[PDB]
Amino acid sequence: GPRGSKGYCAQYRGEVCDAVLVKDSLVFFNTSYPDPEEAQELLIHTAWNELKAVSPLCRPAAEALLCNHLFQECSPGVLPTPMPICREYCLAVKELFCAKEWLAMEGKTHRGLYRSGMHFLPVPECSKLPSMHQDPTACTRLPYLDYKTFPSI
Amino acid sequence: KGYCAQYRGEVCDAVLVKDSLVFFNTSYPDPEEAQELLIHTAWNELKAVSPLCRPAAEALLCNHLFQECSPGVLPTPMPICREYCLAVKELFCAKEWLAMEGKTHRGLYRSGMHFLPVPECSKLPSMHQDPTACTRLPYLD
Ligand SMILES: *[C@@H]1O[C@H](CO)[C@@H](O[C@@H]2O[C@H](CO)[C@@H](O)[C@H](O)[C@H]2NC(C)=O)[C@H](O)[C@H]1NC(C)=O
Ligand SMILES: *[C@@H]1O[C@H](CO)[C@@H](O[C@@H]2O[C@H](CO)[C@@H](O)[C@H](O)[C@H]2NC(C)=O)[C@H](O)[C@H]1NC(C)=O
């Protein structure tokens, strides 16, 4: 895939995010970091282990969000260009699936980010993300979540 | 302004580069105790950060406070490689780093303890520039 000054696009080679990421898709690896494929994989491992603490509703949504956010699909082009999470995807997880662990813990983060549910996790700030309805191709949408009760919109 | 020797402390054993010598700043009357005390004080805040950040943050703090010395009989303290600094501050500790750094810096200032702050990562050299010119944190290898 495309390579450039700040990173490159390549197929995912790990096992944690295997079921979430599109099989043949290219994802962005950030060469600001050393051996980014290894570093990103070590991070997602540790992130997923922390998600054993969250509710059964929240878990698959947060897992998918962390995967789509830490391994961002590359949009077509000659440059390596990561697609951010759609705002609606972010807000869904924040306000619906993980409401108790994320939205509710806002303003209670003074007790410690690690002691505040989910706020220590490398999740994006949903306000700073583009919309599904501004350009549905410019961001990653909420994928199929495997649950094996539900928030309503 | 100091000497290079084997790390003789308790905190940073697994965290420093294997079989390397590290830098002791002789601006302190007891550099090995003073630098040991700095990482001890840092651990008060390390306690409080998540296991996503904690091992990365410790690696950075230990290797910063106990700089790896270059090879040779007149060795020099190496900087941390830019990439490793960025991975720690902005990947592994993306949410928690600045708050932990604020708290650690201020606890040191309150105590009247002399210290160097972790550098701005962008001011550091790349690992690709010259692999022998900067420290690669063992946590990330
Ligand atoms: C690749 O990594 C770099 C370094 O961490 C990122 O640049 C930082 O972006 C954050 C936003 O999360 C800013 O707050 C920092 O000021 C930036 N740091 C530097 C040194 O520029 C960059 O965003 C990453 N690229 C992608 C596409 O995620
Ligand atoms: C050895 O330690 C001393 C004291 O902590 C360092 O001196 C400080 O250096 C910074 C440079 O940014 C200055 O802002 C301070 O004024 C200095 N403090 C004092 C009281 O002298 C010195 O840089 C260290 N040397 C090395 C090579 O690490």
Side-chain angles (χ1 to χ4, degrees), chain A residues 44 47-48 51 61-71 121-123:
Chain A
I44 193 77
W48 271 45
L51 286 175
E63 285 177 356
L65 177 57
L66 280 164
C67 283
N68 289 312
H69 180 245
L70 295 178
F71 302 92
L121 288 178
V123 291

Side-chain angles (χ1 to χ4, degrees), chain B residues 23 25 27-28 67 114-116:
Chain B
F23 180 78
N25 196 322
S27 302
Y28 307 105
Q67 302 194 249
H114 292 265
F115 71 97
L116 294 184

Side-chain angles (χ1 to χ4, degrees), chain B residues 70-81 83-119 121-138:
Chain B
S70 74
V73 285
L74 278 183
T76 189
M78 292 155 157
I80 304 296
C81 296
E83 287 82 5
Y84 290 83
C85 187
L86 287 172
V88 176
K89 285 199 185 170
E90 289 171 24
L91 187 64
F92 286 95
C93 301
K95 297 285 175 138
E96 294 165 293
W97 175 263
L98 284 163
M100 194 207 71
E101 198 185 46
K103 286 181 175 292
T104 39
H105 287 355
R106 285 186 299 273
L108 292 170
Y109 281 118
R110 281 187 197 90
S111 309
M113 293 167 74
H114 292 265
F115 71 97
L116 294 184
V118 171
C121 305
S122 61
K123 306 216 167 200
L124 300 174
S126 170
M127 64 184 283
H128 305 295
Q129 221 172 307
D130 177 28
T132 53
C134 58
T135 299
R136 299 185 180 194
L137 307 174

Side-chain angles (χ1 to χ4, degrees), chain B residues 17 19-32 34-74:
Chain B
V17 182
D19 302 321
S20 67
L21 304 176
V22 295
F23 180 78
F24 297 97
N25 196 322
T26 48
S27 302
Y28 307 105
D30 196 340
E32 309 201 23
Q35 287 162 215
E36 188 75 353
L37 195 43
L38 295 180
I39 192 67
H40 261 284
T41 316
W43 255 100
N44 196 36
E45 306 298 330
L46 282 174
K47 281 194 199 103
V49 307
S50 65
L52 274 76
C53 172
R54 201 186 289 146
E58 188 196 16
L60 184 51
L61 285 163
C62 274
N63 288 274
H64 163 66
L65 290 165
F66 302 89
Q67 302 194 249
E68 189 190 2
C69 292
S70 74
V73 285
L74 278 183

Side-chain angles (χ1 to χ4, degrees), chain A residues 87-99 101-104:
Chain A
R87 183 160 67 233
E88 293 78 15
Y89 182 175
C90 194
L91 291 163
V93 181
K94 179 184 181 174
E95 292 169 338
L96 297 163
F97 297 103
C98 301
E101 303 91 341
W102 192 345
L103 175 70

Side-chain angles (χ1 to χ4, degrees), chain A residues 136-140 142-143 145-147:
Chain A
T137 51
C139 62
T140 299
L142 176 81
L145 307 176
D146 193 74
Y147 293 85

Side-chain angles (χ1 to χ4, degrees), chain A residues 1-2 4-22 25-99 101-107 109-110 112-124 126-127 129-133 135-140 142-143 145-147 150-152:
Chain A
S5 175
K6 303 292 174 291
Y8 63 90
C9 297
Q11 282 162 53
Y12 178 67
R13 302 190 296 112
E15 71 168 320
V16 171
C17 294
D18 199 6
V20 174
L21 303 173
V22 175
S25 63
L26 299 173
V27 296
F28 182 79
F29 295 105
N30 196 335
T31 52
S32 284
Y33 310 138
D35 197 356
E37 303 189 27
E38 281 288 325
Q40 286 169 221
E41 197 72 15
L42 176 64
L43 185 58
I44 193 77
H45 267 281
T46 314
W48 271 45
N49 189 56
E50 291 302 303
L51 286 175
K52 295 186 178 185
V54 308
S55 69
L57 170 64
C58 172
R59 209 193 333 286
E63 285 177 356
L65 177 57
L66 280 164
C67 283
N68 289 312
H69 180 245
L70 295 178
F71 302 92
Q72 299 177 18
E73 191 183 15
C74 291
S75 61
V78 76
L79 300 170
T81 304
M83 291 163 57
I85 300 296
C86 298
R87 183 160 67 233
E88 293 78 15
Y89 182 175
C90 194
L91 291 163
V93 181
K94 179 184 181 174
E95 292 169 338
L96 297 163
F97 297 103
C98 301
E101 303 91 341
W102 192 345
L103 175 70
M105 297 312 295
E106 288 200 319
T109 47
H110 63 272
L113 287 154
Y114 181 47
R115 288 168 165 257
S116 299
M118 210 175 136
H119 285 268
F120 66 93
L121 288 178
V123 291
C126 312
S127 290
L129 296 164
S131 178
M132 190 183 173
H133 308 114
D135 185 0
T137 51
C139 62
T140 299
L142 176 81
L145 307 176
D146 193 74
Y147 293 85
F150 290 100
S152 195

